[PDB]
Ligand SMILES: O=C(O)/C(=C/c1ccc(I)cc1)SS/C(=C/c1ccc(I)cc1)C(=O)O
């Protein structure tokens with residue numbers, strides 16, 4: 001069922017050029033969250049979807065091919081389940097005290113200073129983070145760890161970069 | 174006149190906490206672009222303004238104090254004038270061929286590969302970049318150069334970043 005069902009829905013979503021644009025990604029994400037009222041959102045905005053695309057676009061076509069889209073989609077599916085699980089008060093949002101458990105359940109063990117920066121950038125003035133912000137934060141975070149690890153194969157904890165490389169890493173995102 | 178007029182408008186914009194939030198920034202940027210029918214925009218969205226705020230927030234308060242905001246606002250003023258100057262067909266947008274001249278007029282000399290990457294990430298399927306996307310790109314680009322330079326203390330053209338610093342620089346942005 002599900003290998004074939006997935007190919008069907010990628011093909012219908014990707015349309016005539018067989019790749020998923022940021023706009024196509026935006027539309028499907030907004031259509032789907034509408035069927036989960038336990039995921040509170042103000043919507044996936046175009047800018048957030050361009051960022052999710054850029055970060056997942058390994059082969060630099062500007063768009064998401066089948067394998068890139070499948071990796072993204074499978075993460076979103078794991079992460080949405082984690083979001084529901086760690087929303088222990090059923091507010092439909094992840095507050096400051098729920099967040100470390102949720103991120104830790106996604107494989108990230110960050111220090112306090114980083115959680116504080118993330119809360120400033122992505123959560124509201126209550127320290128509450130809604131679903132599109134949470135997804136957007138995790139797609140980026142997972143991509144940044146992966147980028148760094150690709151440049152640090154021997155686990156030195158350091159990478160060395162020139163300006164061209166730096167700009168590629170920080171602006172194609 | 175203009176040192177005092179500026180302090181007046183910061184104070185009125187920043188309001189009760191004396192710092193400019195992403196929402197306050199959004200609102201002023203949208204109010205001002207409305208008076209320039211030569212700038213085409215779909216609007217400054219909340220997520221883009223949170224990003225501009227994070228990238229300019231040197232002291233990590235979550236908001237833009239007087240000096241941070243003055244730096245941002247003075248760049249926006251120079252950059253809007255450049256946008257108008259390099260929109261040679263008055264489309265209200267900067268296309269692929271207008272873009273290198275515009276960025277070069279802002280002090281960034283990038284190679285072809287980097288201009289292509291910027292177009293993929295910030296310009297639409299036509300290769301057109303509207304005003305909020307242009308500002309947003311420049312704020313981030315200027316911040317990423319500045320961040321490189323702060324880390325290249327020996328003037329070698331290379332930086333060493335550890336994982337902690339990488340995650341801070343990429344996630345609080
Ligand atoms: O638990 C799951 O299986 C899913 C959870 C989920 C929840 C929110 C988002 I945004 C994306 C995925 S995705 S399964 C699914 C596939 C599907 C995708 C697009 C369309 I149009 C119809 C069905 C759906 O719920 O619609």
Ligand SMILES: O=C(O)/C(=C/c1ccc(I)cc1)SS/C(=C\c1ccc(I)cc1)C(=O)O
Pocket residue numbers: 182202204205206209249250253
């Ligand atoms: O060069 C100019 O005159 C202006 C440049 C400008 C600044 C920001 C944007 I967005 C678009 C254009 S208009 S903003 C301004 C003063 C001003 C500030 C807030 C408001 I509301 C109206 C005017 C000034 O440049 O002195």
Ligand SMILES: [Ca+2]
Pocket residue numbers: 013014015016017018019020021024
């Ligand atoms: Ca498509």
Ligand SMILES: [Ca+2]
Pocket residue numbers: 057058059060061062063064065068
């Ligand atoms: Ca691709």
Ligand SMILES: [Ca+2]
Pocket residue numbers: 086087088089090091092093094095098
């Ligand atoms: Ca909650």
Ligand SMILES: [Ca+2]
Pocket residue numbers: 041042043130131132133
């Ligand atoms: Ca949101």
Ligand SMILES: [Ca+2]
Pocket residue numbers: 186187188189190191192193194197
């Ligand atoms: Ca304020």
Ligand SMILES: [Ca+2]
Pocket residue numbers: 230231232233234235236237238241
């Ligand atoms: Ca600040």
Ligand SMILES: [Ca+2]
Pocket residue numbers: 259260261262263264265266267268271
């Ligand atoms: Ca133009």
Ligand SMILES: [Ca+2]
Pocket residue numbers: 214215216303304305306
């Ligand atoms: Ca725009």
